Amino acid sequence: PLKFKLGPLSYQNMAFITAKDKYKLYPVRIPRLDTSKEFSAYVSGLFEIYRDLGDDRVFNVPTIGVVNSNFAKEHNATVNLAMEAILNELEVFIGRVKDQDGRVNRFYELEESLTVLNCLRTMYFILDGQDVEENRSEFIESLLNWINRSDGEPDEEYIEQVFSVKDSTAGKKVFETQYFWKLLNQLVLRGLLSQAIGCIERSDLLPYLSDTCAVSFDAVSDSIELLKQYPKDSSSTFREWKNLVLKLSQAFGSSATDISGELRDYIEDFLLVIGGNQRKILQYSRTWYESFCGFLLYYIPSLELSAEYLQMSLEANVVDITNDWEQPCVDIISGKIHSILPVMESLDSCTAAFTAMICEAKGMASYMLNSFAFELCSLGDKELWPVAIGLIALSATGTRSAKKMVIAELLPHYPFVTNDDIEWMLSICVEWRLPEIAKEIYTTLGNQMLSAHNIIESIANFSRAGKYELVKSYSWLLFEASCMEGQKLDDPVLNAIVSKNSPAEDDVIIPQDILDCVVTNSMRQTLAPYAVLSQFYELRDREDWGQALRLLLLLIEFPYLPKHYLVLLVAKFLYPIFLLDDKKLMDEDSVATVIEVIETKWDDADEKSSNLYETIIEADKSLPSSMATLLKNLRKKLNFKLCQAFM
């Protein structure tokens, strides 16, 4: 029975019931979308970085020819630094999130995202896509740092729990039983070398013996010495390494130590069996990274054939899922539903689209930036509008040769109701070379201002487009209204026309206290007939009868002012003020010219003039009934004016 309506909004959909007594409406969101300031600020950090990345990080071939050695360095460098920077903006988002409540669940979903990034990092943005065994320093340190943040196993909590177990074998301490060496060997396998040295120290291992007779120390010293030395460069590097890593156990097994039959037996056996046989390394791997590192570093033991070996190791016994490509997918599926759906089908596997993507490439992140951003625009989150155009301008997307018809559709569809929204529309119109849509925008804006009760913003809006016909129609609207009073209607109009382009008048413009535009606005050209009406009013107040009459006639004669504003200007202004006029002397020329205009333009009927006549009467009647009542009476006052010039 339920019906659902999906608007443009992306966070505020509506479900409803078509049934009586079911008049309750339930707001429905789309999960995994946030309109938060934390989210747009995250996006803002990613946007600068994403743009600057160029065509790099999509795996291009690094040329080292004459075209162009320098490109190789540029490509490897940019992508690597961009990774570091992406992780820090990512920390900042995540940090905000695990400090708020009900985002206890979200906090956990973001620790997983870090894990996939850590595995990716270790291989290509640490090593630099070089050799497997390039950097050692940066590999260990980054991994350890990450496991600390991506995963929650404190060097403290983890190893307390492990030391608290020591019972159930012997009553003797943790280091005299299996519990400690199982961990110690694990820490070494996960490349958590720093923690591992510390674990020996904490356990109280060092007082407990103080004897030994180990020979393997001296050996390893002198070997590495001669080794690293090179008496002229010796091939003995790999050969010696291989021998050393293996031979350790057997020497320990003979060396005298005064310790119990627990400790000794365990350590000997353990150490041997583990780092001796391919299977036993994997047997004690409780994670993919342990197995993955373990073979390269600790088995046969420098970068040679460690390839084939690691492959085979894995292929034989499967190891625990971590967070890799397919691994969180395999984790997730058994789990809750909402995940598993969008999760699957995003790996380049049994598809043609992602095959097509990397073959041409050798910009998914860019697409995501241009995808998410647009989705938010269609909700009204103005913050991502700068982001959108910005990625387009540099590290451009779209073609200005066929995606012009699609992009065109987006400009009007998206809710524009700030400034940033408005600036984005114009910005895109210049860039793709379609000025005509920007002119349509300005028309569309005037049409909003007309029904929102802004008879100022509307005029300005239309003015921008430069079409004389529309500006004139609003001036006339307004010119007509201000004819029922002997001043210009309200005061900001008034002010602005009379202050001219000089600082004249102290009268502040608009409801603002600003003097700023009281030194600008000289109503001229299009606004010139409108300007002259307001000025005719100033002239009565500054007691001119002569120049006053003159301005009023000038407008009456103008053939581009309406004809229906005849009976209106003369009825309100010329008809009462009959005396003042009568005093003055009028010649044959002025009389005859005024007369032609009355003969042609005066109306005894018509739309505008019938309506305007009804209101004149209501204000203060000049004529009782009939417009051209006036003509007869007027001519009398006119005979007198004519007679008085002539005597």
Binding site: P1, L2, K3, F4, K5, L6, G7, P8, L9, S10, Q12, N13, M14, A15, F16, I17, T18, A19, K20, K22, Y23, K24, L25, Y26, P27, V28, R29, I30, P31, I337, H338, L341, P342, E345, S346, T351, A353, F354, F374, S378, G380, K403, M405, V406, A408, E409, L410, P412, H413, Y414, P415, F416, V417, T444, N447, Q448, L450, S451, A452, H453
Partner: protein, 307 residues
């Protein structure tokens, strides 16, 4: 968020966002349209105004774009579309801010639908009634909302709608003017795509096949991601059918067809970014569908509510 009562005393026939989606209007058998403006603060729809916009049951209401100002067309069983413009400086909470632009007595049967044309195709509105006459109205000017001429009529249904042929009947347009002007119209089992010729008389340009049951909703997707079209139909047999119509006159192809509601899909409604279809159907659950990179729509999420 949270449950809210609209305050309509009869049942809600429609929920329609603005084009900018800043308003929701609901219409009911209680003779009112209630228009709510979105308070983001509570993420609830707070009552702006309520007025009787006809002297009968209001069953189709639709917003026009706030690009010419806010216009309301509303369809009633009293035979008239009544056109209304929102004034902010007119009173709210009284029904004094909707001034009647017109009454169109150009509808000879009782209306069941009136639906606006998208911004991009011009300001036009289509009608359908219970005399089975598709009405094409063109405003004479986009700034004169007080007259609309009947420019075309096409006799859709073979038998007119009567007290048992009564079903949801829907009018949807083509958001692209970079595609020839059209409007898809679903009436019973047939969905017939009408197109404006160069003669100013509408012709049948295409028929949508593969409608095994009644179409309870038809919704034309804005062409975004691509410049081709997609039309989704919700049908009574739990089928979401998304057919793709390519422009080369029109070619018909299927994109995908899948059925998952399994009772009847009552509504299909596309987002305005034309990439997420949400459909609801019998069983009370709303399925939210997003395209894969195998280029087909799949159910990413299931929301269950009340019946």
């Amino acid at each position: 968020m949270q449950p809210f009562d609209s305050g309509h005393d009869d049942l809600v026939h429609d929920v329609v966002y603005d084009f900018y989606g800043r308003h929701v209007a609901t219409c009911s058998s209680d003779q009112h349209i209630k228009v709510f403006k979105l308070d983001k603060d509570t993420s609830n729809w707070e009552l702006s105004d309520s007025w009787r916009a006809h002297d009968s049951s209001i069953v189709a209401i639709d917003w026009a774009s706030p690009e010419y100002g806010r216009i309301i067309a509303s369809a009633s069983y009293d035979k008239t579309v009544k056109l209304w413009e929102e004034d902010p400086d007119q009173e709210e909470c009284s029904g004094r801010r909707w001034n009647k632009l017109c009454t169109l007595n150009d509808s000879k049967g009782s209306l069941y639908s009136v639906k606006f044309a998208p911004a991009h195709l011009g300001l036009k509105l289509a009608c359908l009634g219970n005399d089975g006459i598709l009405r094409l109205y063109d405003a004479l000017e986009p700034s004169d909302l007080r007259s609309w001429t009947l420019t075309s009529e096409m006799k859709v249904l073979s038998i007119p709608p009567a007290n048992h042929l009564q079903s949801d009947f829907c009018l949807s347009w083509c958001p692209s003017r970079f595609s020839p002007e059209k409007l898809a119209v679903s009436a019973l089992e047939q969905a017939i795509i009408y197109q404006r010729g160069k003669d100013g008389k509408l012709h049948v340009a295409a028929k949508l096949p593969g409608h095994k049951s009644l179409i309870r909703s038809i919704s034309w997707a804005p062409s975004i991601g691509r410049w081709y079209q997609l039309i989704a139909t919700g049908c009574k047999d739990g089928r979401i059918r998304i057919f793709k119509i390519t422009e080369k006159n029109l070619q018909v192809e299927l994109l995908s067809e899948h059925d998952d509601h399994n009772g009847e899909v009552w509504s299909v409604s596309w987002n305005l970014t034309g990439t997420i279809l949400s459909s609801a159907g019998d069983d009370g659950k709303v399925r939210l569908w997003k395209a894969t990179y195998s280029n087909e729509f799949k159910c990413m999420s299931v929301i269950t509510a009340q019946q």
